[PDB]
Design a protein around this ligand. Structure first.
Ligand SMILES: [Ca+2]
Ligand SMILES: [Ca+2]
Length: 270
């Protein structure tokens, strides 16, 4: 009834599928994903109670030494749907058929209920991201002619890579109320094209619904990549990037109670 993964007990890359009906196709996949930590004292643990659906992350890391300080953040503990293109983990038991070409995929709402508790000023975000690849089912990383799209609905003390492009309005729902929100749009080239949408009014807890195609449409429109609509939207990842090169301790707790993807009768890109 409770799935648990733990760093460092389960190795340096703990992860596991959430497969509540035991059918061999996960509905989501969880990873502690301390991808830029070389060594730390303490632990990080992610539990997932299969009756309530609560995902709970608890992290107490100290003495942190990074694998590469130029990558800035320490890690991105996360839950995702679809095929994460960096590894062989996937989750496809859901209503949206990911991966799919962006030219074929319906728009969808993403609704997340959550609560974040970073300790002592730790720089963090709460970031949803997707990877857009030239092949349907990538598992070996990302190339220069592909894209990372990130949507930050909370942040403290972190700025997206690259430089600010513009601000956009996106109609979202916060705590049951439809609201026009503003997102800054940032663009970088970091080995691949990077586009991040950073909310101007961070939301540290509650229930948030966003229309995914509002973001992908802007990412398409500002992209320098050729044949953008032939890319596959591989996945939707939800997690908290944290840390900076001068952070040596990182204590953080958070909870996610619901993730829902809701299809809409319309194209993703408009
Ligand atoms: Ca399943
Ligand atoms: Ca994968």
């Amino acid at each position: 009834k409770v799935l648990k993964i733990r760093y460092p007990d389960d190795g340096e890359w703990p992860g596991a599928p959430i497969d509540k009906d035991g059918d061999g196709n996960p509905e989501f996949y969880i990873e502690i994903n301390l991808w830029n930590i070389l060594n730390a004292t303490g632990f990080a643990e992610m539990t997932y109670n299969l009756t309530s659906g609560v995902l709970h992350y608890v992290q107490q890391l100290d003495n942190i030494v990074l694998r590469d300080r130029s990558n800035w953040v320490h890690g991105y503990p996360e839950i995702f749907y679809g095929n994460k293109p960096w590894n062989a983990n996937y989750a496809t038991d859901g209503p949206i058929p990911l991966p799919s070409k962006v030219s074929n995929l319906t728009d969808f709402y993403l609704t997340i209920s959550y609560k974040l508790e970073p300790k002592n000023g730790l720089p963090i975000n709460f970031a949803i991201e997707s990877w857009l690849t030239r092949e349907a089912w990538r598992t070996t990383g990302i190339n220069s002619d592909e894209q990372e799209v990130m949507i930050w609905i909370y942040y403290d003390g972190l700025q997206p890579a690259g430089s600010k492009v513009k601000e956009i309005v996106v109609p979202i729902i916060v705590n049951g109320t439809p609201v026009n929100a503003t997102f800054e749009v940032w663009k970088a080239n970091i080995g691949w094209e990077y586009v991040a949408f950073r909310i101007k009014t961070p939301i540290k807890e509650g229930t948030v619904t966003i229309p995914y195609g509002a973001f992908i449409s802007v990412a398409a429109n500002i992209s320098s990549l050729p044949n953008y609509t032939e890319l596959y939207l591989e996945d939707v990842e939800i997690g908290t990037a944290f840390g900076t090169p001068s952070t040596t301790s990182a204590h953080l707790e958070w909870w996610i109670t619901n993730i829902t993807l809701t299809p809409l009768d319309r194209p993703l890109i408009s």
